[PDB]
Design a binder for this molecule. Sequence first.
Ligand SMILES: O=P(O)(O)O[C@@H]1[C@@H](OP(=O)(O)O)[C@H](OP(=O)(O)OP(=O)(O)O)[C@@H](OP(=O)(O)O)[C@H](OP(=O)(O)OP(=O)(O)O)[C@@H]1OP(=O)(O)O
Ligand SMILES: O=P(O)(O)O[C@@H]1[C@@H](OP(=O)(O)O)[C@H](OP(=O)(O)OP(=O)(O)O)[C@@H](OP(=O)(O)O)[C@H](OP(=O)(O)OP(=O)(O)O)[C@@H]1OP(=O)(O)O
Ligand SMILES: O=P(O)(O)O[C@@H]1[C@@H](OP(=O)(O)O)[C@H](OP(=O)(O)OP(=O)(O)O)[C@@H](OP(=O)(O)O)[C@H](OP(=O)(O)OP(=O)(O)O)[C@@H]1OP(=O)(O)O
Ligand SMILES: O=P(O)(O)O[C@@H]1[C@@H](OP(=O)(O)O)[C@H](OP(=O)(O)OP(=O)(O)O)[C@@H](OP(=O)(O)O)[C@H](OP(=O)(O)OP(=O)(O)O)[C@@H]1OP(=O)(O)O
Ligand SMILES: O=P(O)(O)O[C@@H]1[C@@H](OP(=O)(O)O)[C@H](OP(=O)(O)OP(=O)(O)O)[C@@H](OP(=O)(O)O)[C@H](OP(=O)(O)OP(=O)(O)O)[C@@H]1OP(=O)(O)O
Ligand SMILES: O=P(O)(O)O[C@@H]1[C@@H](OP(=O)(O)O)[C@H](OP(=O)(O)OP(=O)(O)O)[C@@H](OP(=O)(O)O)[C@H](OP(=O)(O)OP(=O)(O)O)[C@@H]1OP(=O)(O)O
Lengths: 361, 364, 367, 369
Amino acid sequence: NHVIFKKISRDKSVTIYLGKRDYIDHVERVEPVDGVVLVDPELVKGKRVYVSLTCAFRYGQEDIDVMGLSFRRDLYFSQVQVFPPVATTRLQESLIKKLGANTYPFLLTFPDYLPCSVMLQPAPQDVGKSCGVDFEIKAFATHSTDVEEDKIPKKSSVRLLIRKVQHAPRDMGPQPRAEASWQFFMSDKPLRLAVSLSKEIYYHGEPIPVTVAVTNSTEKTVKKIKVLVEQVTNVVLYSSDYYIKTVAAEEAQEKVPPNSSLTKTLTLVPLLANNRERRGIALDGKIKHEDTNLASSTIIKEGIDKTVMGILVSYQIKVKLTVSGLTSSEVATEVPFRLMHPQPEDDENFVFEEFARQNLK
Amino acid sequence: NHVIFKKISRDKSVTIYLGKRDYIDHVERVEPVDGVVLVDPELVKGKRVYVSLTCAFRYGQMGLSFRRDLYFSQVQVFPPVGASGATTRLQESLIKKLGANTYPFLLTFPDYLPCSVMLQPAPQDVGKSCGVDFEIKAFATHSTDVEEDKIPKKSSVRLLIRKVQHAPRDMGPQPRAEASWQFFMSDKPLRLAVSLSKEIYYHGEPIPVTVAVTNSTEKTVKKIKVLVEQVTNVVLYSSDYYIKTVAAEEAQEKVPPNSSLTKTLTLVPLLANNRERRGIALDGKIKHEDTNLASSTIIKEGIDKTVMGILVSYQIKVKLTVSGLLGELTSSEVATEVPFRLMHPQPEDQDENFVFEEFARQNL
Amino acid sequence: NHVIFKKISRDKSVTIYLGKRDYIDHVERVEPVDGVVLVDPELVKGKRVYVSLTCAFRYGQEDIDVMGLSFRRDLYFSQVQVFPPVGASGATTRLQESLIKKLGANTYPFLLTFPDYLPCSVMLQPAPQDVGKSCGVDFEIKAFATHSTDVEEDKIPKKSSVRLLIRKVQHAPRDMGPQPRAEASWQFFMSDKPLRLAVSLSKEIYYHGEPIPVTVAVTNSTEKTVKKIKVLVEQVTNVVLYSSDYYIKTVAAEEAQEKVPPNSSLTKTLTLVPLLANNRERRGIALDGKIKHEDTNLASSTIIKEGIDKTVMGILVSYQIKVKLTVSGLLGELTSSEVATEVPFRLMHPQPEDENFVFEEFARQNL
Amino acid sequence: NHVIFKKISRDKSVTIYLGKRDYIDHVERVEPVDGVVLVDPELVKGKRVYVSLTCAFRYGQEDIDVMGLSFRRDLYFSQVQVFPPVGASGATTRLQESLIKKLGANTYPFLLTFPDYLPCSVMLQPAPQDVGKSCGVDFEIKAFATHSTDVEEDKIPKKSSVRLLIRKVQHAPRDMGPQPRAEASWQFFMSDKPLRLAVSLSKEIYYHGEPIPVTVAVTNSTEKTVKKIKVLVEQVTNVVLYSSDYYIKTVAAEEAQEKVPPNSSLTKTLTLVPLLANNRERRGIALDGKIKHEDTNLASSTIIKEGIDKTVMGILVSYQIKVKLTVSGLLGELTSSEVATEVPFRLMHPQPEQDENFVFEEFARQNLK
Ligand SMILES: O=P(O)(O)O[C@@H]1[C@@H](OP(=O)(O)O)[C@H](OP(=O)(O)OP(=O)(O)O)[C@@H](OP(=O)(O)O)[C@H](OP(=O)(O)OP(=O)(O)O)[C@@H]1OP(=O)(O)O
Ligand SMILES: O=P(O)(O)O[C@@H]1[C@@H](OP(=O)(O)O)[C@H](OP(=O)(O)OP(=O)(O)O)[C@@H](OP(=O)(O)O)[C@H](OP(=O)(O)OP(=O)(O)O)[C@@H]1OP(=O)(O)O
Ligand SMILES: O=P(O)(O)O[C@@H]1[C@@H](OP(=O)(O)O)[C@H](OP(=O)(O)OP(=O)(O)O)[C@@H](OP(=O)(O)O)[C@H](OP(=O)(O)OP(=O)(O)O)[C@@H]1OP(=O)(O)O
Ligand SMILES: O=P(O)(O)O[C@@H]1[C@@H](OP(=O)(O)O)[C@H](OP(=O)(O)OP(=O)(O)O)[C@@H](OP(=O)(O)O)[C@H](OP(=O)(O)OP(=O)(O)O)[C@@H]1OP(=O)(O)O
Ligand SMILES: O=P(O)(O)O[C@@H]1[C@@H](OP(=O)(O)O)[C@H](OP(=O)(O)OP(=O)(O)O)[C@@H](OP(=O)(O)O)[C@H](OP(=O)(O)OP(=O)(O)O)[C@@H]1OP(=O)(O)O
Ligand SMILES: O=P(O)(O)O[C@@H]1[C@@H](OP(=O)(O)O)[C@H](OP(=O)(O)OP(=O)(O)O)[C@@H](OP(=O)(O)O)[C@H](OP(=O)(O)OP(=O)(O)O)[C@@H]1OP(=O)(O)O
């Protein structure tokens, strides 16, 4: 029972139908956008209907008694003609049959140099403004005087805010543990801290087994071991904004006394759910929407300037050790890992629905 | 030569006299309603005359689909309460002129109310007629039976006054906006800066919109269009949203590649500019002559906006049409908004002469 | 005849002598730093004296009401051993042989070369209105002595050291092609009548102090009047390390009140000279030295070399001619339009080409 | 039990009594000098006794015989008459009324007030390595008798005079500056990676003897190791009259034992106490008295008042926390004191707040032995 998403123009001349709201990027390639446009042939007589896929980075928010700063960079734009009619998919053939002979198909493909859906609304403490990477499917009708005069009337247009969602690639090699070790000499006795994860890539919702191995050869005591999942966000267009936020924390009060060692495996799950405060964090949608999660790890492709990603999202495990004196010292170290959605898979009946996403409040 | 407004009951037992139809809200405080009621003492014998100020939000042309009362206050004019002495010069004067059957009333506004806003929608618009009315009503009540008191319609008289938004002392900081675009496969920015002279403008006052296009692209800015958009948000019963152009100006200059053009267009947002007066937030009925565009809503600190009923705001929109763009960004998609407030000008700091007139407002 | 610059350590164990304060970058190559170190052999017994050339970008200034923010990136560092002698610096120069003979056999030579990936001396102290902080690219020649327990403690004692703030100065290259006129034209349609503005300079490269002949050619086919023609030399500064600061400042202006009436045209040649002298306010401008020093000028145009990330220049300085036209409104409206266009050009120093020695303190002359 | 300080003239004709040796400057105002002069009425018959407060900057050594050996700028001078008694003759303060009652009717009061444009007691005797000479700001209370000869020439004998070297001592105001904070980062040659050093003190003003908690936050993103973190209290002295002498001296040093390895960060709070006690060598340092005296400390931070030319302070004393990082693999590019940041702070004395009983004592200050 396939749920199809429809939206209709104001003047009811153009209606657009999509198979999905969210389109999978599995690194190797990206799911193309196959849909259909249903035209009212009376209202489109001597007109031309096109469909456009735009990816755009945006920056800046409305502010009272504060100067309005706005910025947009288009990162990809591609347009095709649906009407008049000039391979197909099963989804289209089926939707055409169901909807009539006024239904016309469109296929818009993503390239490999784009980021995935990333958004950020800042907290009061944060410097820097609202920014994000949107993806817009837009169907719209033009006259033959609308071409060559650059006119696209609003009532004849219909836009949809789809998501490019980051999934792990289908064939992956076996994953080496994400492991590092440090040696903090204190009076020329070493305090050795090793940190190790099971794998390099974790899935949203999947728990992360963090193995910590303190080897205290010092005369000092490790009073406290804290383990975090930090999300590091770097806005890399317009404004060099930097956010780092804990999205998961576990704090054992294990003591490692002088001339002893303690191995230990904490399990963290970095979730948007864990954060009442959803601001200052890179999400893959709006705070209000239900289907919105933490943004996946940015995957910069070989020889692609990172700045064309707009927002850079990375995750890391941070281990903090509190260490006694004879006040006290605190050392900390980071271990990077990638967080994305699980790898993808290998008549029909249609229930039609408004594209508008489900809120939580 | 003070023009006084009178209206008389059907049974001619109660007549009400007001100094004004329109009462000034200058944010700090609101002009109280000082008037007098003239009773025919024969026809109000063993009766009680009151005067009430009601503010109410309404929705629908259910006969009337929905009403929320936002403020109600009533006072007794007859029989006379206490001193019986006037509170204002206008009253003392009206009493002297009209006789000893004249009784004064003072009804005050609070600070949590909106100002007169009305909206009759166009055919294209979804959502219905709605508005915030203010009613001064004088009426007589008697008892012919021990078990109940009665209020005849014939003994009552209602007046639809306006709460009109006038400027405070304070003005916001000089409104300013910047926006930049970088179109697909273009290394080069198109910068649009917009500046108004001040934050508050008066109805009828012209608005000097300074536009500063800095085209570093290989594309040409074919057209600069400047609008005054009025944004209306019905915030009781139905979440209706209207946005309408009430002024538009289209500069003739084009901005060629690798050039910049500063320029100052002047707009005047007026109800006069709009043949179609429907779909727009007004401060009165379409038919009445003294009716203008609604003033900017001024929500007071820590007052839930929903108790305003209709939210009216104004903004300058600057749209740039750009050559070679195949549908990526359009005129209203290559655009910025700059907010400003629109209200009426600030107020000011032996007997006089009175010409009496029917309260009924002048149609067009 | 030849003015030599000396500076001496606090403990008087190490003295350094340089031919120049300012070393020429003529794009093709950069003048190497040839000097000598005079050691007091009693005070350097069982010690090692080195000389280091450091180029470093710096950012941030002292503030009593503001938290102290500082940042340094070393862009180049190279060190050589002068004592004990090992011939580290290889073959010698005439300047050294002469200085050795004049100063004694306790004099030892050093040669430190610049590479091609460095910027030239650029500095910037901001004005009150300006958002970002003090920043610049310094060049330091430093001679210093270390014990064999000084390598063993990673310590380099201050009294035994001597630093000199030299300048890398941007000169035009010796072989240059013939220089095309730097010219562009624009066509500002106003009601579909064009206003054509052509701007032309004599050449692409000008020298500090050289006058710039800006030819403006307005061809007004509109119904509007050009009320005023203003011509500027704007200096555009982009801090491209730590903080993305942007400054644009007029360093020369000429404003004819020539009127070009409807359906007429006016050619005209204004002459501007972009000088630090023209600017009372010396803050917000990219200089090649400190505001106080006399020999300080406007910074030369940054010359980014082929396939060198611009960010390793630290501060990017460029110059342009800006032409502003004020244009009358059709309704005699109280305001009017203004159009403007930029023509880029580069600004640097002119191209390059017994002995007797008067010794002098390196310290630069203030105003 | 109030300890009063007396000194007597050689000829025993004039004795001066002070409540204190040290007078408090708390920025807002300065403690005036209230004392009394006890005259031997036989020895001051037909004479006039005055008391003078002089503040003077000096440079060099004190004039021997006739030779001018020292440069002197008077920064303030004020004189009053104690004998014969002037007008009311009545005490101004309880201390005086009490001292008069205790000492007899040959006791006369004096009040000499400080203005706001003066520095506080600063002195400096240089070390062998130091260029520049002995200098300081002295405060002298002097009582002396003057008489008149047969030729018209009034005389001031030394034997009839008594001088006291009081101290103007810097105590804290109500106000404190904002919590001192510094950040510095380095990116070493051929290194894409920053070494971040942040430094934070608890407050802006510290008291002499109070410990200073210096919080250091090294964030080593480099492949190099921070081998040593050294934390100093440096005292910066600027002689701003006659000779532009500049001294900077460590008066406290602490060397944390933690090293910061590649790709780690270490927060840490060292505690320093800048004291004269910590310094065997007491030369090259700005003190508030002579090296020999016991009550002598480090000089307080100079507090230049708004629109008062700093040069009329004579010596400028300031304090700062310096944090030096020693870093592995650096071949001379940047050193310990070249990979360093400073955080300024002010150092002064703590804020201020029927008859009594008097134990009299020689003004002469207690030496160390
Ligand atoms: O001839 P068209 O119908 O193809 O073009 C019009 C259409 O363009 P757009 O969609 O913005 O691209 C209107 O938007 P719309 O369909 O949503 O709504 P409406 O048609 O206005 O109800 C727009 O209204 P807005 O931006 O002012 O609100 C209007 O502007 P303007 O002259 O001010 O107004 P009117 O001429 O309507 O009085 C345009 O006229 P030009 O650009 O002058 O040719
Ligand atoms: O409830 P409100 O007012 O706070 O938020 C609504 C508003 O969002 P906005 O202004 O972008 O913040 C609408 O934008 P709009 O008028 O610009 O529409 P256009 O795209 O221009 O046609 C949006 O589109 P529509 O349904 O009206 O077409 C609508 O649905 P939805 O697509 O899901 O939201 P988004 O993903 O677009 O934010 C949002 O509601 P919810 O469904 O609860 O989220
Ligand atoms: O043409 P119409 O019918 O639409 O307008 C009339 C209608 O008011 P309407 O506009 O609908 O509100 C009458 O209402 P009614 O009799 O139902 O009774 P109530 O109003 O309930 O007492 C009203 O009479 P009344 O009030 O004294 O009884 C009368 O005066 P008035 O209120 O002063 O004028 P407005 O400023 O209100 O227009 C209006 O006159 P005209 O504008 O000249 O035609
Ligand atoms: O080793 P460092 O570089 O970290 O610190 C040294 C440095 O301290 P400061 O920068 O003032 O904090 C010297 O000061 P400075 O700049 O004047 O002279 P330098 O030219 O540097 O000698 C100081 O000598 P000084 O002040 O008397 O001249 C010296 O002490 P001292 O016993 O004399 O030992 P050495 O003179 O034999 O080294 C310190 O050594 P330690 O305490 O062992 O570390
Ligand atoms: O007040 P400031 O900062 O503007 O200028 C002074 C400052 O310059 P700074 O910017 O730090 O280099 C001193 O640096 P310092 O004490 O840290 O010592 P080091 O430099 O580490 O040795 C410098 O000392 P020193 O170098 O001779 O020892 C001194 O002479 P000098 O370099 O010849 O003059 P400039 O040509 O540098 O201005 C400068 O004095 P003035 O004569 O008034 O100008
Ligand atoms: O070289 P000198 O003359 O300038 O300084 C001396 C002078 O100091 P003084 O002016 O009082 O401060 C002597 O007092 P004095 O009455 O002759 O002098 P005046 O009456 O003032 O003229 C003082 O002796 P004593 O008689 O008070 O016992 C003697 O030692 P000490 O008590 O430790 O000194 P203080 O504790 O009092 O400072 C001082 O010696 P050194 O400073 O070490 O050379």
